[PDB]
Design an enzyme around this catalytic site. Structure first.
Site, PDB file in Angstrom:
ATOM      1  N   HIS A  11      11.414 117.211   4.665  1.00 58.42           N
ATOM      2  CA  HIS A  11      12.324 116.061   4.701  1.00 58.42           C
ATOM      3  C   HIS A  11      13.603 116.144   3.856  1.00 58.42           C
ATOM      4  CE1 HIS A  11       9.423 113.991   7.214  1.00 58.42           C
ATOM      5  NE2 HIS A  11       8.482 114.174   6.305  1.00 58.42           N
ATOM      6  N   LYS A  38       6.533 119.384  16.524  1.00 60.10           N
ATOM      7  CA  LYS A  38       6.529 118.079  15.872  1.00 60.10           C
ATOM      8  C   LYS A  38       7.545 117.195  16.597  1.00 60.10           C
ATOM      9  CE  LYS A  38       6.854 115.700  11.417  1.00 60.10           C
ATOM     10  NZ  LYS A  38       6.934 115.823   9.936  1.00 60.10           N
ATOM     11  N   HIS A 116       5.483 111.342   1.609  1.00 62.42           N
ATOM     12  CA  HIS A 116       5.467 111.002   3.032  1.00 62.42           C
ATOM     13  C   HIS A 116       6.721 110.215   3.398  1.00 62.42           C
ATOM     14  CE1 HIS A 116       4.370 107.794   6.068  1.00 62.42           C
ATOM     15  NE2 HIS A 116       4.187 108.886   6.789  1.00 62.42           N
ATOM     16  N   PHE A 117       7.331 110.565   4.528  1.00 64.23           N
ATOM     17  CA  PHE A 117       8.475 109.818   5.047  1.00 64.23           C
ATOM     18  C   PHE A 117       7.969 108.792   6.055  1.00 64.23           C
ATOM     19  CE2 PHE A 117      12.126 108.749   7.596  1.00 64.23           C
ATOM     20  CZ  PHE A 117      13.196 108.786   6.705  1.00 64.23           C
ATOM     21  N   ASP A 118       8.134 107.504   5.753  1.00 66.09           N
ATOM     22  CA  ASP A 118       7.536 106.453   6.593  1.00 66.09           C
ATOM     23  C   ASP A 118       8.451 105.961   7.714  1.00 66.09           C
ATOM     24  OD1 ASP A 118       4.890 105.236   6.830  1.00 66.09           O
ATOM     25  OD2 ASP A 118       5.822 103.307   6.391  1.00 66.09           O
TER      26      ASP A 118
HETATM   27  N1  LIG Z   1       1.193 105.380   2.346  1.00 65.40           N
HETATM   28  C1  LIG Z   1       0.870 106.690   2.388  1.00 65.40           C
HETATM   29  N2  LIG Z   1       0.637 107.361   1.232  1.00 65.40           N
HETATM   30  C2  LIG Z   1       0.317 108.664   1.253  1.00 65.40           C
HETATM   31  N3  LIG Z   1       0.220 109.335   2.413  1.00 65.40           N
HETATM   32  C3  LIG Z   1       0.450 108.707   3.595  1.00 65.40           C
HETATM   33  C4  LIG Z   1       0.781 107.362   3.605  1.00 65.40           C
HETATM   34  N4  LIG Z   1       0.951 106.998   4.893  1.00 65.40           N
HETATM   35  C5  LIG Z   1       0.726 108.095   5.661  1.00 65.40           C
HETATM   36  N5  LIG Z   1       0.421 109.133   4.860  1.00 65.40           N
HETATM   37  C6  LIG Z   1       0.080 110.532   5.245  1.00 65.40           C
HETATM   38  O1  LIG Z   1       1.053 111.176   6.071  1.00 65.40           O
HETATM   39  C7  LIG Z   1       0.392 112.084   6.971  1.00 65.40           C
HETATM   40  C8  LIG Z   1       1.142 112.112   8.302  1.00 65.40           C
HETATM   41  O2  LIG Z   1       0.390 112.872   9.255  1.00 65.40           O
HETATM   42  N6  LIG Z   1       1.416 110.777   8.830  1.00 65.40           N
HETATM   43  S1  LIG Z   1       2.600 110.560   9.898  1.00 65.40           S
HETATM   44  O3  LIG Z   1       2.942 109.165   9.958  1.00 65.40           O
HETATM   45  O4  LIG Z   1       2.103 110.985  11.177  1.00 65.40           O
HETATM   46  C9  LIG Z   1       3.911 111.486   9.392  1.00 65.40           C
HETATM   47  C10 LIG Z   1       5.115 111.291  10.294  1.00 65.40           C
HETATM   48  C11 LIG Z   1       6.507 111.060   9.701  1.00 65.40           C
HETATM   49  O5  LIG Z   1       6.727 111.709   8.442  1.00 65.40           O
HETATM   50  C12 LIG Z   1       7.475 111.604  10.739  1.00 65.40           C
HETATM   51  N7  LIG Z   1       8.536 110.541  10.824  1.00 65.40           N
HETATM   52  C13 LIG Z   1       8.461 109.214  11.360  1.00 65.40           C
HETATM   53  C14 LIG Z   1       9.526 108.382  11.509  1.00 65.40           C
HETATM   54  C15 LIG Z   1      10.844 108.863  11.097  1.00 65.40           C
HETATM   55  O6  LIG Z   1      11.862 108.227  11.176  1.00 65.40           O
HETATM   56  N8  LIG Z   1      10.894 110.208  10.557  1.00 65.40           N
HETATM   57  C16 LIG Z   1       9.804 111.104  10.386  1.00 65.40           C
HETATM   58  O7  LIG Z   1       9.967 112.231   9.909  1.00 65.40           O
HETATM   59  O8  LIG Z   1       6.716 111.893  11.924  1.00 65.40           O
HETATM   60  C17 LIG Z   1       5.319 112.007  11.628  1.00 65.40           C
HETATM   61  C18 LIG Z   1       4.574 111.305  12.755  1.00 65.40           C
HETATM   62  O9  LIG Z   1       4.858 109.899  12.714  1.00 65.40           O
HETATM   63  C19 LIG Z   1      -1.048 111.593   7.104  1.00 65.40           C
HETATM   64  O10 LIG Z   1      -1.966 112.677   6.943  1.00 65.40           O
HETATM   65  C20 LIG Z   1      -1.242 110.568   6.004  1.00 65.40           C
HETATM   66  O11 LIG Z   1      -2.295 110.962   5.117  1.00 65.40           O
END
Ligand SMILES: Nc1ncnc2c1ncn2[C@@H]1O[C@H](C(=O)NS(=O)(=O)C[C@H]2[C@@H](O)[C@H](n3ccc(=O)[nH]c3=O)O[C@@H]2CO)[C@@H](O)[C@H]1O
EC number: 4.6.1.18
Length: 121
Positions: A11, A38, A116-118
Site C-alpha cells: 500500500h 488481486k 490493513h487498508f480498509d
Molecule cells: N480491523 C482489522 N485489523 C486488523 N486486520 C484486519 C482488519 N480488518 C481486516 N483485516 C485483515 O485484512 C486481511 C485482508 O484479507 N482483508 S481484505 O479486506 O480482504 C483486504 C483488502 C484491501 O486491503 C484491498 N482494498 C479495499 C478497498 C480499497 O479501496 N483498497 C484496497 O487496497 O482489497 C482487499 C480485498 O478487499 C484479512 O486477513 C484480515 O485479517
C-alpha cells in the site's frame, strides 16, 4: 514478512503522476499477482510518517466490525488499481485511477502501526 512490512509492500509508494501503465507494473513488482490477480489494491503516495500518523487520528468503525480503524484528517494522494474485464492470470491487467481522498486504515501492535487498508472516502 511482518504485518507492518506487508502493508508497506502492498500500500505504500511515497512520491511528491501515475501513468496508464502504473498498476500493471506495480501490482507485479510488489508481488500482488504471484498467486492470483488481486482484484482491487490502493497505493498511497504520502510519506510513511504521514500514513503512520493516521493511527492516532479519527477513530472509525472497520468494515469487519473491529474498532481499530482510523480515518485521515487530511486528504491524501492515492492510486487505485482495479482489475479489468479482459484480465486473465498470469497476465493480470489493471485500470489505474489517481485520487485525492481521506484514507481509512486498521492499526495493530507496539509500535501501533497500519496493518490493513480498509477504504478511501
Ligand atoms: N480491523 C482489522 N485489523 C486488523 N486486520 C484486519 C482488519 N480488518 C481486516 N483485516 C485483515 O485484512 C486481511 C485482508 O484479507 N482483508 S481484505 O479486506 O480482504 C483486504 C483488502 C484491501 O486491503 C484491498 N482494498 C479495499 C478497498 C480499497 O479501496 N483498497 C484496497 O487496497 O482489497 C482487499 C480485498 O478487499 C484479512 O486477513 C484480515 O485479517
Amino acid at each position: 514478512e511482518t504485518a507492518a512490512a506487508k502493508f508497506e509492500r502492498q500500500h505504500m509508494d511515497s512520491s511528491t503522476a501515475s501513468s496508464s501503465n502504473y498498476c500493471n507494473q506495480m501490482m507485479k513488482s510488489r508481488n500482488l499477482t504471484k498467486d492470483r490477480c488481486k482484484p482491487v489494491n490502493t497505493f498511497v503516495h504520502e510519506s510513511l510518517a504521514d500514513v503512520q500518523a493516521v493511527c492516532s487520528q479519527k477513530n472509525v468503525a472497520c468494515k469487519n466490525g473491529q474498532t481499530n480503524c482510523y480515518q485521515s484528517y487530511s486528504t491524501m494522494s492515492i492510486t487505485d488499481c482495479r482489475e479489468t474485464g479482459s484480465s486473465k492470470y498470469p497476465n493480470c491487467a489493471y485500470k489505474t485511477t489517481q485520487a485525492n481522498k481521506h484514507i481509512i486504515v486498521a492499526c495493530e501492535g507496539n509500535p501501533y502501526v497500519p496493518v490493513h487498508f480498509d477504504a478511501s472516502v
